[PDB]
Design a protein around this ligand. Structure first.
Ligand SMILES: [Mg+2]
Ligand SMILES: [Mg+2]
Ligand SMILES: [Mg+2]
Ligand SMILES: [Mg+2]
Ligand SMILES: [Mg+2]
Ligand SMILES: [Mg+2]
Ligand SMILES: [Mg+2]
Ligand SMILES: [Mg+2]
Ligand SMILES: [Mg+2]
Ligand SMILES: [Mg+2]
Ligand SMILES: [Mg+2]
Ligand SMILES: [Mg+2]
Ligand SMILES: [Mg+2]
Ligand SMILES: [Mg+2]
Ligand SMILES: [Mg+2]
Ligand SMILES: [Mg+2]
Ligand SMILES: [Mg+2]
Ligand SMILES: [Mg+2]
Ligand SMILES: [Mg+2]
Ligand SMILES: [Mg+2]
Ligand SMILES: [Mg+2]
Ligand SMILES: [Mg+2]
Ligand SMILES: [Mg+2]
Ligand SMILES: [Mg+2]
Ligand SMILES: [Mg+2]
Ligand SMILES: [Mg+2]
Ligand SMILES: [Mg+2]
Ligand SMILES: [Mg+2]
Ligand SMILES: [Mg+2]
Ligand SMILES: [Mg+2]
Ligand SMILES: [Mg+2]
Ligand SMILES: [Mg+2]
Ligand SMILES: [Mg+2]
Ligand SMILES: [Mg+2]
Ligand SMILES: [Mg+2]
Ligand SMILES: [Mg+2]
Ligand SMILES: [Mg+2]
Ligand SMILES: [Mg+2]
Ligand SMILES: [Mg+2]
Ligand SMILES: [Mg+2]
Ligand SMILES: [Mg+2]
Ligand SMILES: [Mg+2]
Ligand SMILES: [Mg+2]
Ligand SMILES: [Mg+2]
Ligand SMILES: [Mg+2]
Ligand SMILES: [Mg+2]
Ligand SMILES: [Mg+2]
Ligand SMILES: [Mg+2]
Ligand SMILES: [Mg+2]
Ligand SMILES: [Mg+2]
Ligand SMILES: [Mg+2]
Ligand SMILES: [Mg+2]
Ligand SMILES: [Mg+2]
Ligand SMILES: [Mg+2]
Ligand SMILES: [Mg+2]
Ligand SMILES: [Mg+2]
Ligand SMILES: [Mg+2]
Ligand SMILES: [Mg+2]
Ligand SMILES: [Mg+2]
Ligand SMILES: [Mg+2]
Ligand SMILES: [Mg+2]
Ligand SMILES: [Mg+2]
Ligand SMILES: [Mg+2]
Ligand SMILES: [Mg+2]
Ligand SMILES: [Mg+2]
Ligand SMILES: [Mg+2]
Ligand SMILES: [Mg+2]
Ligand SMILES: [Mg+2]
Ligand SMILES: [Mg+2]
Ligand SMILES: [Mg+2]
Ligand SMILES: [Mg+2]
Ligand SMILES: [Mg+2]
Ligand SMILES: [Mg+2]
Ligand SMILES: [Mg+2]
Ligand SMILES: [Mg+2]
Ligand SMILES: [Mg+2]
Ligand SMILES: [Mg+2]
Ligand SMILES: [Mg+2]
Ligand SMILES: [Mg+2]
Ligand SMILES: [Mg+2]
Ligand SMILES: [Mg+2]
Ligand SMILES: [Mg+2]
Ligand SMILES: [Mg+2]
Ligand SMILES: [Mg+2]
Ligand SMILES: [Mg+2]
Ligand SMILES: [Mg+2]
Ligand SMILES: [Mg+2]
Ligand SMILES: [Mg+2]
Ligand SMILES: [Mg+2]
Ligand SMILES: [Mg+2]
Ligand SMILES: [Mg+2]
Ligand SMILES: [Mg+2]
Ligand SMILES: [Mg+2]
Ligand SMILES: [Mg+2]
Ligand SMILES: [Mg+2]
Ligand SMILES: [Mg+2]
Ligand SMILES: [Mg+2]
Ligand SMILES: [Mg+2]
Ligand SMILES: [Mg+2]
Ligand SMILES: [Mg+2]
Ligand SMILES: [Mg+2]
Ligand SMILES: [Mg+2]
Ligand SMILES: [Mg+2]
Ligand SMILES: [Mg+2]
Ligand SMILES: [Mg+2]
Ligand SMILES: [Mg+2]
Ligand SMILES: [Mg+2]
Ligand SMILES: [Mg+2]
Ligand SMILES: [Mg+2]
Ligand SMILES: [Mg+2]
Ligand SMILES: [Mg+2]
Ligand SMILES: [Mg+2]
Ligand SMILES: [Mg+2]
Ligand SMILES: [Mg+2]
Lengths: 106, 111, 197, 127, 172, 49
RNA sequence: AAUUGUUGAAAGGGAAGGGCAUUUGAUCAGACA
RNA sequence: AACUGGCGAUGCGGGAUGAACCGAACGUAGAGUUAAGGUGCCGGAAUACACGCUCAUCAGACACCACAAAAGGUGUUAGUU
RNA sequence: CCCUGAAAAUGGAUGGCGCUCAAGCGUGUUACCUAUACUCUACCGUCAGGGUUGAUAUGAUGCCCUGACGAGUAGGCAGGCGUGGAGGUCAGUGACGAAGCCUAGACCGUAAGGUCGGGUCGAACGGCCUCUAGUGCAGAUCUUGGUGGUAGUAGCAAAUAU
RNA sequence: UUUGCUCCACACAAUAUAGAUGGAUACGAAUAAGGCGUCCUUGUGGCGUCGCUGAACCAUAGCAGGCUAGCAACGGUGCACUUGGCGGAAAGGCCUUGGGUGCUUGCUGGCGAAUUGCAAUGUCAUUUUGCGUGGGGAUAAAUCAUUUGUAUACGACUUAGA
């Protein structure tokens, strides 16, 4: 209607890191309204899209997507680890992100 | 070291899952009963549970039955260690020395 | 959650607000802090006066300008508690900072928007009852902050227009919950009641 | 059409370039190992370039295979191009660089005839 | 040192040809698991008798479960500990519901008030105080006055989201 | 070491920097406090030396 | 070759250059069949 | 001087920083589990839980380690005769 | 536990911000984060243990199974890469363009290095098995030559005057 | 200097983007106390009620939301117009009058949807600039040189010149 959102909103927080070396192969994902890591085993294996724009048209759009998947729960607060076709940019740190509802299980 | 008293349950689950043999070295996975038989059949022992039996009872051939088993190769414990600092005695809230009946839970997390 | 989060500083402990503001900032959440002068600091006013003076003495020797800059206004003190919790010399830090605004008083837009509170930095919830603490306005004014009277003038007039605003509001919601009572016991209402509403 | 092989996995596509080859002109990028006594590089301090070592060496399966699947062999004339006659699923022929234009057309041709791939099939091509 | 269980322990001076059936001594150790408990048993026996683990044996180690775990009790406690300047005995009174739940807060109190860690305390005696008014210490006697009641003012609520739109109460 | 003979500094730092000024008309950085009961008139004036 | 002029593209808040990784721009191989 | 372990000749993780400390010693990678050390924010990780203690008009805050003493206090704390 | 005792020279350091029912001190309970370590797999190389001359196709220092290991200065050894000349050979490349030089184009090698396109050029040159040494450069206040920043700067003001 | 500048209108084009994708939803103050309703003697007042989280409130069905019929209401909301008024802290936005108009899922209907082939953001934001079109509106100056000396190493300053 006014709303069409079929996914949950997310944020690209950090790469996996230690204090002093990061790992672009895993990004860490904050899912809106997901609080425990009990709460976040529901989004395990869901698919994630970071959508973005560009100025060159491509396959007939100026809109692009990087695709990924939740893979495990990260620490006590419902942050989630995830990996992507290509690694998310690092400029994207604190950019939004779509966790979808599929694969499903209800 | 941390050490103590294994149960049949964790001697079972060690041999079955991570037990290999020293067969001209060659660290050989067990995986079939006729691997054992060919080398410990000498002294009885013609089955994997035959191994377990001769181990868990310290029977007449425990030296060659034991040394046949290639030193086990565990992971870091799954739960973690439960101590904060490990290199104290068990009695002093660390991880080493004889913790006895509990050497199991530890092992069944490292397996 | 929201495009911009407006925070009523009044009642909030400096570092514990700075800490949560820093994190909302870095996770992409634009934030605006208001009434910074009504912000709180643990310890009585003297300890925090003394503290600001200790700050105040550090300056580059050969040229006092290139050295540390000391800012007097309750908001710049607040931004300072914040900036040091942000990797502010990086590309990403300048990013996150631009999402943040700090003000004395509640200036336009934000006086008509709703402003929100942070329980985990709320002094009345955080501090132990009986400790002594500091109001950032008094502390600022004692080290050079000029505009403490003007602000409370401008605010004492704000809080008037807003009481009126609230007044009309409370008067209207009396009608609405009035009409809401004629509609009760009807067929609709009792059904919703079943579905939790 | 090339004989079938596992996924070619390269392992380290980046060129190992000599230390400070990038810092003084005098110093070619041509790899040399740092023999000095302080050299972070030789010491493997965290954040310096990495050096060539034998873990990097490629899977014996796919080793020497160009993208296609064909170990390229160098060719100076038809006789040489002919040594590949019973091998085309396995051994492309790269025309030698000094082979004239009138002589690559003999070689290109004969390649097609016999079913052999030619890697650089365009040099001195009268277009 | 952890969450505590009470253990009776029983040992005896390894038998000899000319002294079979040596004499058997019991302690009640306050420890977390049975491996520590026996350690302590030998720690203390070698403080009274000519034994060590090397030459004796534990006869029985048995857990002791509190007799009435929903009967609030007033516990007197007797302690010896080492300070940074010497060693000294004490007596405290703990109000709780099982000998073991008290030994827990004892070691906490000893730690907070007297900076004494486990290694420096000896639990001389723990005892259920039968009649009231044998309750000597005040911080306990407060809780034994008739028809006692008391508010819990300035109540403070664990906020579950970062932002709030109210402005809290501390009401109660 | 340590001076030798203490002696006062040359010049007054509260007149720094010794640059040429913005314009020839130095500015009134301040006006009298206001007595809003008097009549109203100007509180400064201009001329040429 | 160092070094230089022009032209073209690009970056530059107290050096420059490098590692891992990815965005974007440019350029390219192979592989379909 | 003695014994061992090290550094030198050695990178990796912790100790902000650091030849020698803690952990752990290195072929190229993937998944997992951890060590020492940490988890307000910088900074990955509980503004977690529970009992106490401390309010400093120069509080205090983690080994090696980057110092403080005798002597005092009717601050408050719990104990002793 | 806190206070007093407790005095130094640029301005400044529990690492920083900051923190006071702590984000402080003692102690307890869990959860959680992440090393080149541990476990499993893949690939490389090393070492070892075995198997396999039976012709009628291609490697016997070869082929095939299997296990374990991999830090490194001085230093040893090994197996390779590149140059000038020399014996053999591919009846090798070339004025329908050899060598050389250029090239944020291409491919092979872990690497020394190797191969190709295109441009520029003009007379020679290479693979493979052997032979040989005036055989590999970043450094030696190295040798000879060339070139920068410096910098359109220092300066071009004695001797009277045009 | 080749018909330029500017405000409103639409069109094509380019170029962006620290990161829309139902709604940032307005008292103030206290916290060992308050919000709301109600009553009065209008108080530091009587009485009632609530909290214990926004887990809320509002919105939300319709080709991404198409084409149409009607009923019950006289309510709601979008738009462009107009009435009166408020807001200077950064007001640049808020409240109000009155018609016109679109929609209304408040209720009852007629019609459409496939083949995008079992997922591939499946494109619906808002930045800034550029080029022509015609609906309003507007017709400067600063610099060089010359010049004063309240100025000055040079730039700069300060004057003066139809
Ligand atoms: Mg980051
Ligand atoms: Mg991580
Ligand atoms: Mg990737
Ligand atoms: Mg960034
Ligand atoms: Mg960020
Ligand atoms: Mg885990
Ligand atoms: Mg678990
Ligand atoms: Mg653990
Ligand atoms: Mg620790
Ligand atoms: Mg396991
Ligand atoms: Mg953002
Ligand atoms: Mg400075
Ligand atoms: Mg800062
Ligand atoms: Mg940012
Ligand atoms: Mg509180
Ligand atoms: Mg390579
Ligand atoms: Mg060298
Ligand atoms: Mg050295
Ligand atoms: Mg070095
Ligand atoms: Mg030819
Ligand atoms: Mg060429
Ligand atoms: Mg050619
Ligand atoms: Mg003990
Ligand atoms: Mg003893
Ligand atoms: Mg003792
Ligand atoms: Mg909590
Ligand atoms: Mg002097
Ligand atoms: Mg003198
Ligand atoms: Mg002034
Ligand atoms: Mg003024
Ligand atoms: Mg600068
Ligand atoms: Mg085909
Ligand atoms: Mg040592
Ligand atoms: Mg040594
Ligand atoms: Mg030496
Ligand atoms: Mg060594
Ligand atoms: Mg070492
Ligand atoms: Mg380190
Ligand atoms: Mg450490
Ligand atoms: Mg240790
Ligand atoms: Mg920081
Ligand atoms: Mg974090
Ligand atoms: Mg001080
Ligand atoms: Mg003092
Ligand atoms: Mg001092
Ligand atoms: Mg302090
Ligand atoms: Mg110590
Ligand atoms: Mg330190
Ligand atoms: Mg003395
Ligand atoms: Mg003392
Ligand atoms: Mg005292
Ligand atoms: Mg005493
Ligand atoms: Mg204390
Ligand atoms: Mg200094
Ligand atoms: Mg200190
Ligand atoms: Mg810290
Ligand atoms: Mg702290
Ligand atoms: Mg603690
Ligand atoms: Mg648990
Ligand atoms: Mg937890
Ligand atoms: Mg490591
Ligand atoms: Mg590895
Ligand atoms: Mg052989
Ligand atoms: Mg080696
Ligand atoms: Mg080699
Ligand atoms: Mg050679
Ligand atoms: Mg040669
Ligand atoms: Mg030559
Ligand atoms: Mg040449
Ligand atoms: Mg060129
Ligand atoms: Mg090139
Ligand atoms: Mg180049
Ligand atoms: Mg190349
Ligand atoms: Mg090739
Ligand atoms: Mg090629
Ligand atoms: Mg050519
Ligand atoms: Mg040529
Ligand atoms: Mg000639
Ligand atoms: Mg030859
Ligand atoms: Mg030779
Ligand atoms: Mg020579
Ligand atoms: Mg060299
Ligand atoms: Mg060289
Ligand atoms: Mg040189
Ligand atoms: Mg040279
Ligand atoms: Mg050298
Ligand atoms: Mg030289
Ligand atoms: Mg010279
Ligand atoms: Mg020069
Ligand atoms: Mg000149
Ligand atoms: Mg000159
Ligand atoms: Mg001169
Ligand atoms: Mg004269
Ligand atoms: Mg941007
Ligand atoms: Mg308001
Ligand atoms: Mg009111
Ligand atoms: Mg009330
Ligand atoms: Mg009322
Ligand atoms: Mg009345
Ligand atoms: Mg009233
Ligand atoms: Mg009342
Ligand atoms: Mg509400
Ligand atoms: Mg509609
Ligand atoms: Mg319908
Ligand atoms: Mg009608
Ligand atoms: Mg109508
Ligand atoms: Mg204004
Ligand atoms: Mg504003
Ligand atoms: Mg305005
Ligand atoms: Mg209408
Ligand atoms: Mg609708
Ligand atoms: Mg669309
Ligand atoms: Mg026009
Ligand atoms: Mg005129």
């Amino acid at each position: 209607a006014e709303s069409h959102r079929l996914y949950v909103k997310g944020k690209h927080l950090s790469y996996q890191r230690s204090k002093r070396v990061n790992n672009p192969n895993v990004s860490l994902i904050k899912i809106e309204g997901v609080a425990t890591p009990q709460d976040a085993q529901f989004y395990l294996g869901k698919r994630i899209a970071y959508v973005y724009r560009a100025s060159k048209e491509v396959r007939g759009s100026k809109i692009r997507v990087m695709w990924g998947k939740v893979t495990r729960t990260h620490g006590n607060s419902g942050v989630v680890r995830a990996t992507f076709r290509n690694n998310l940019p690092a400029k994207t740190f604190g950019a939004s992100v779509r966790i979808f509802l599929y694969p499903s299980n209800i | 070291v941390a050490y103590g008293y294994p149960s049949y349950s964790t001697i079972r689950q060690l041999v079955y899952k991570r037990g290999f043999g020293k067969i001209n070295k060659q660290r050989v996975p067990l995986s079939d009963n006729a691997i054992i038989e060919a080398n410990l059949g000498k002294y009885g022992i013609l089955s994997i549970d035959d191994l377990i039996h001769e181990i868990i009872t310290v029977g007449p051939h425990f030296k060659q039955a034991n040394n046949f088993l290639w030193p086990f190769k565990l992971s870091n414990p799954s739960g973690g260690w439960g101590v904060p600092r490990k290199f104290k005695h068990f009695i002093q809230g660390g991880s080493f020395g004889n913790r006895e009946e509990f050497i199991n839970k530890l092992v069944k997390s490292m397996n | 959650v929201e495009p911009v989060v407006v925070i009523d500083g009044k009642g909030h402990l400096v570092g514990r607000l700075a800490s949560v503001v820093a994190k909302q900032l870095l996770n992409g959440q634009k934030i605006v802090v208001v009434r910074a002068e009504e912000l709180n600091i643990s310890g009585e006013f003297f300890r925090n006066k003394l503290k600001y003076h200790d700050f105040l003495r550090k300056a580059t020797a050969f040229n006092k300008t290139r050295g540390p800059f000391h800012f007097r206004a309750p908001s710049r003190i607040f931004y300072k508690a914040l900036r040091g919790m942000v990797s502010h010399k990086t590309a990403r830090g300048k990013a996150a900072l631009e999402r943040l605004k700090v003000f004395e008083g509640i200036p336009p837009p934000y006086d008509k928007k709703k402003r929100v509170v942070v329980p985990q930095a709320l002094r009345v919830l955080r501090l132990k009852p009986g400790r002594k603490y500091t109001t950032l306005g008094k502390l600022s004014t004692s080290v050079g902050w000029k505009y403490e009277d003007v602000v409370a003038k401008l605010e004492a007039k704000r809080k008037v227009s807003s009481a009126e605003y609230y007044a009309k509001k409370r008067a209207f919601t009396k009608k609405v919950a009035s009409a809401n009572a004629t509609a009760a016991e009807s067929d609709v209402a009792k059904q919703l009641a079943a579905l939790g509403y | 059409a090339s004989l079938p092989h596992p996924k070619i996995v390269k392992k380290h596509t980046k060129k190992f370039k000599r230390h400070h080859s990038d810092r003084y002109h005098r110093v070619a990028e041509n790899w040399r190992k740092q023999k000095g006594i302080d050299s972070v590089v030789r010491r493997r301090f965290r954040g310096n370039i990495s050096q060539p070592k034998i873990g990097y060496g490629s899977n014996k399966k796919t080793k020497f295979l160009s993208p296609s699947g064909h170990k390229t062999f160098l060719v100076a004339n038809v006789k040489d191009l002919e040594t590949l006659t019973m091998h085309t699923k396995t051994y492309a022929a790269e025309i030698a660089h000094n082979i004239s234009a009138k002589n690559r057309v003999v070689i290109l041709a004969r390649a097609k005839a016999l079913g052999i791939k030619v890697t650089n099939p365009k040099g001195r091509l009268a277009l | 040192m952890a969450h505590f269980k009470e253990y009776q322990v029983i040992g005896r001076r390894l038998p000899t040809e000319s002294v079979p059936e040596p004499k058997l001594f019991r302690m009640r150790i306050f420890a977390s698991n049975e491996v520590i408990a026996k350690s302590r048993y030998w720690y203390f026996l070698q403080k009274l008798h000519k034994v060590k683990k090397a030459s004796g044996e534990i006869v029985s180690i048995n857990q002791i479960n509190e007799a009435h775990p929903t009967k609030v009790k007033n516990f007197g406690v007797w302690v010896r500990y080492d300070s940074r300047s010497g060693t000294h005995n004490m007596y405290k009174e703990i109000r709780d519901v099982s000998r073991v739940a008290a030994v827990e807060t004892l070691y906490q109190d000893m730690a907070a008030r007297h900076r004494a860690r486990f290694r420096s305390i000896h639990i001389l005696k723990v005892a259920e105080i039968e009649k009231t008014a044998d309750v000597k210490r005040q911080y306990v006697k407060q809780f034994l006055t008739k028809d006692l009641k008391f508010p819990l003012p300035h109540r403070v609520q664990k906020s579950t989201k970062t932002f709030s739109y109210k402005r809290p109460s501390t009401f109660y | 070491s340590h001076r030798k003979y203490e002696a006062p500094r040359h010049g007054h730092l509260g007149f720094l920097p010794r640059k040429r000024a913005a314009s020839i008309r130095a500015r009134v950085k301040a006006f009298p406090k206001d007595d809003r009961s008097k009549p109203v008139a100007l509180t400064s004036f201009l001329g040429y030396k």
